[PDB]
A paper describes a structure:
Volume-regulated anion channels (VRACs) participate in the cellular response to osmotic swelling. These membrane proteins consist of heteromeric assemblies of LRRC8 subunits, whose compositions determine permeation properties. VRACs are composed of proteins belonging to the conserved LRRC8 family, whose expression is restricted to chordates. This family contains five members in humans, termed LRRC8A–E. All of them share a close sequence relationship and consist of an N-terminal pore domain (PD) followed by a cytoplasmic leucine-rich repeat domain (LRRD). In these assemblies, LRRC8A (or SWELL1) constitutes an obligatory subunit, which is essential for the targeting of channels to the plasma membrane.
We then set out to characterize the full-length protein and collected cryo-EM data for an LRRC8C homomer from three independent preparations. Unexpectedly, the two-dimensional (2D) classes from these datasets showed in all cases a heptameric assembly, which was confirmed by 3D reconstruction. Despite the large size of the combined dataset, the non-symmetrized reconstruction of the full-length protein did not reach high resolution, probably due to the intrinsic mobility of the complex. After application of C7 symmetry, we were able to obtain a structure extending to 4.6 Å for the full-length protein and 4.1 Å for the PD. At low contour, the map displays an envelope for the entire protein, and at higher threshold, where the density of the more mobile LRRDs has largely disappeared, it defines the structure of its membrane-inserted portion. This map allowed a molecular interpretation with subunits consisting of the structure of the PD determined by cryo-EM and the X-ray structure of the LRRD to obtain a symmetric channel with a pore radius of 6 Å at its extracellular constriction. In this assembly, close subunit interactions are restricted to the extracellular part, whereas contacts within the remainder of the protein are scarce. In contrast, there are fewer contacts in the case of LRRC8C homomers, which have formed a larger heptameric assembly. In this case, the LRRDs show increased mobility compared to the A subunits, and we did not find any indication of tight subunit interactions. Similarly, the interaction interface in the PD is reduced and restricted to contacts between the ESDs. In that respect, the larger heptameric assembly of LRRC8C homomers described in this study is noteworthy, as it would allow for a further increase of the pore radius, although there is so far no evidence for the existence of heteromeric channels with larger oligomeric organization in a physiological context.
Residue numbers in the entry:
A (entry chain F): 16 to 59, 95 to 176, 236 to 527, 531 to 804
B (entry chain E): 254 to 304
């Protein structure tokens, strides 16, 4: 602030200025004290030469000739030197006395001292500096737009050089002017009776000698400026390249500096070569990253990670990550986790320390741009079995995931078509068995054909995209489970008819109206599960009777009003979903569905229940729901295996006590109105709620 | 990696030795020059009437 801004030439100039100021003050003092002119009339055994002149006349003559004969420069030399020294001092100190650049200088001094003070600089070369990086970058952005301070300093140096040149040029001629003795011929005759006078003043010779030495000082002063001027105009201090810190410490950051920054760097380096080295560290971005890593390590402990450990959806020990700046190393200390979850974590690099986590088979990624290490990639290829990835604009999709051979289940949540899906070939995935895609795929990508040799389950659930091209799905010979949710086909696709190995079929939100393609489903004798969620189905074709393998039927949220009798011919159906439909009467043929265990007609218009419905003694889940039933038949007591009942939303008046005969159906599984439950006998309700 | 400080100190000592040598060399001769009394003959005649 007051000392680190002085190069050696500046110190020498300051010392010379101090010496010149002392010389000027001494000269002024002697001029005031002893600088007197003695005068005598000039023209006239040797005897005395009395001039019969009084003291007053002598003083008058001294004053007159002093004003006349004595050289103006000779008389003004002390004041002249004092003024020149004061101007030199003022132009030297105006560099820091100007507040506009003084603020920048003070900020630079503070930041340089703080950066040199931080031991983390030495640690990086071999705590709160993390926030100090923000001040460092603020200063580098703000002050690189300056360079005016360099121009100010150059102008000051030029002014000093010009002053020195003028000083030498005129003082060289003026020094010879002064003389010890002098002669003056003023018109003091008829005033004092004399005209010619010889005079002298004491300081002259001394002044001469003094002036000589003074000139020498100024000469050196000028020479000093020349060197600095040469140093100003030989090195081009506007740009500074380290080329040594990068070579030694092996850091490619800190490329270069602007005019003002290079100027200040040169000044500090000339003042001290090591201060620049210590200050350059906080410009490095990699150093900032490592300091943030150290701060995160201080912030994060394995205890916090183990606290956040929980059970994932697919039965694994998972550590969800929701907002982090990287990978804490303590996470690699906890190998018991089988799954890992990442949410909104950008700029992630996976080191070889992932090899520590042996018992890892699942990974969850939510909007994360992640890259791996070679050992990390090999470990993921050889160990991972399940993978979940969420990406928004494909920038968080890691390409190396296409090379994981041992992966079994993969989940994609992110648009791929944005028409063709932007999917790379799935050839390396030699063990992929389950695939789930959440995208906007219009035509099926060819990459899936590269995995169908061992693929068993492929799921594509678009947000409404029509599956216009079904050509590749016929290649899924090994596929046993297929779900096409919101594929907007409006009909049963012909591709599904080409998959004889299929077992479970889902067509949720496909808006199927004409479903007369059931005959084609007769080519599939393994169709155990068929799903038709959220469609406009109003008619059930008779051909559904020919599906021998049917075990589960789904027709919830459709336009079904009158359900045909032959719909009950599939005696092997165990799950029958008829809720949220226009069903009003249940045909008695449902009694033949002895194997049935599920029945849901919630949000339908059912008004009565046939007694044959109670013949299905294997029914363990009966969801009557919100219907138009006004009374409850006692035959419900026959269902000893019934575990769940849902009759809330109906017109029931009194519940028969036979509901107590349902052993597996308790109060928790009983969905009835409060009055309906209270109408039951005390013993029945006590046995339902507890064991009395 | 320094050793420049030793050279600086050597230069300072050499300068001091040279200064002392010059001081002795000229002061030894110059001391005898001064005298208490002195005589001067200047052209102060026709100015004060004496030389």
């Amino acid at each position: 602030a007051f000392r680190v801004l002085k190069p050696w030439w500046d110190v020498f100039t300051d010392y010379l200025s101090v010496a010149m100021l002392m010389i000027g003050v001494f000269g002024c003092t002697l001029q005031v004290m002893q600088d007197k002119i003695i005068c005598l009339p000039k023209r006239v055994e040797m005897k005395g030469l009395k001039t019969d002149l009084d003291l007053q006349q002598y003083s008058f003559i001294n004053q007159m000739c002093y004003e006349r004969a004595l050289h103006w420069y000779a008389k003004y030399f002390p004041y002249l030197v004092l003024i020149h020294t004061l101007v030199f001092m003022l132009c030297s100190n105006f560099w820091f006395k100007f507040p506009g650049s003084s603020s920048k200088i003070e900020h630079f001094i503070s930041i340089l001292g703080k950066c040199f003070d931080s031991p983390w600089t030495t640690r990086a070369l071999s705590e709160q500096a993390k926030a100090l990086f923000e001040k460092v970058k603020k200063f580098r952005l703000h002050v690189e737009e300056g360079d005016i301070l360099y121009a100010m300093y150059v102008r000051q140096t030029v002014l000093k050089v010009i002053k020195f040149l003028i000083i030498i040029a005129y003082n060289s001629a003026l020094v010879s002017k002064v003389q010890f003795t002098v002669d003056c011929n003023v018109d003091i005759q008829d005033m004092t009776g004399y005209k010619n006078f010889s005079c002298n003043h004491t300081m002259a010779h001394l002044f001469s000698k003094l002036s000589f030495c003074y000139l020498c000082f100024v000469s050196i002063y000028g020479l000093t400026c020349l060197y600095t001027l040469y140093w100003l105009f030989y090195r081009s201090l506007r740009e500074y390249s380290f080329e040594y810190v990068r070579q030694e410490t092996g850091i490619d950051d800190i490329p270069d500096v602007k005019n003002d920054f290079a100027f200040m760097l040169h000044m500090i380096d000339q003042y001290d070569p090591l201060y620049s080295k210590r200050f350059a560290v906080f410009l490095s971005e990699v150093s900032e990253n490592k300091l943030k890593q150290l701060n995160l390590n201080n912030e994060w402990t394995p205890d916090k990670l183990r606290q956040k450990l929980q059970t994932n959806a697919h039965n694994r020990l998972e550590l969800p990550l929701i907002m982090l700046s990287g990978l804490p190393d303590t996470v690699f200390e906890i190998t018991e986790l089988q799954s890992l979850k990442l949410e909104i974590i950008k700029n992630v690099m996976i080191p070889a320390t992932i090899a520590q986590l042996d018992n890892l088979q699942e990974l969850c990624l939510h909007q994360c741009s992640v890259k791996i290490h070679s050992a990390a990639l090999s470990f993921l290829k050889e160990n991972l079995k399940v993978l979940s990835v969420k990406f928004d604009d494909m920038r968080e999709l890691p390409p190396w995931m296409y090379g994981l051979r041992n992966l079994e289940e993969l989940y994609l949540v992110g648009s791929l078509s944005h028409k063709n899906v932007t999917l790379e070939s799935l050839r390396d995935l030699k063990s992929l068995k389950i695939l789930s895609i959440k995208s906007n795929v219009s035509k099926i990508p060819q990459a899936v054909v590269d995995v169908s040799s061992h693929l068993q389950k492929m799921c594509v659930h678009n947000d409404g995209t029509k599956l216009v091209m079904l050509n590749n799905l016929k290649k899924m010979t090994n596929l046993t489970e297929l779900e096409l949710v919101h594929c907007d086909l409006e009909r049963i696709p012909h591709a599904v008819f080409s998959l004889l190995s299929l077992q479970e079929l889902d067509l949720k939100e496909n808006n199927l109206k004409s479903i007369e393609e059931i005959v084609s489903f007769q080519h599939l004798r393994k169709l155990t599960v068929l799903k038709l969620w959220y469609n406009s189905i109003a008619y059930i074709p008779e051909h559904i009777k020919k599906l021998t393998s049917l075990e589960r039927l789904f027709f919830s949220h459709n336009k079904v009003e009158v359900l045909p009798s032959h719909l009950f011919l599939c005696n092997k159906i165990r799950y029958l979903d008829l809720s949220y439909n226009d069903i009003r009467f249940i045909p008695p043929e449902i009694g033949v569905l002895q194997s049935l265990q599920y029945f849901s007609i919630t949000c339908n218009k059912v008004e009565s229940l046939p007694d044959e419905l109670y013949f299905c003694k294997k029914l363990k889940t009966l969801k009557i729901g919100k219907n138009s039933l006004s009374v409850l038949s006692p035959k419900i007591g026959n269902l000893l295996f019934l575990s769940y009942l849902d009759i809330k939303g109906n017109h029931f008046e009194v519940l028969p006590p036979e509901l107590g005969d349902c052993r597996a159906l308790k109060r928790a599984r009983l969905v009835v109105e409060d009055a309906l439950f209270e109408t039951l006998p005390s013993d029945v309700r006590e046995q339902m709620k507890a064991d009395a």
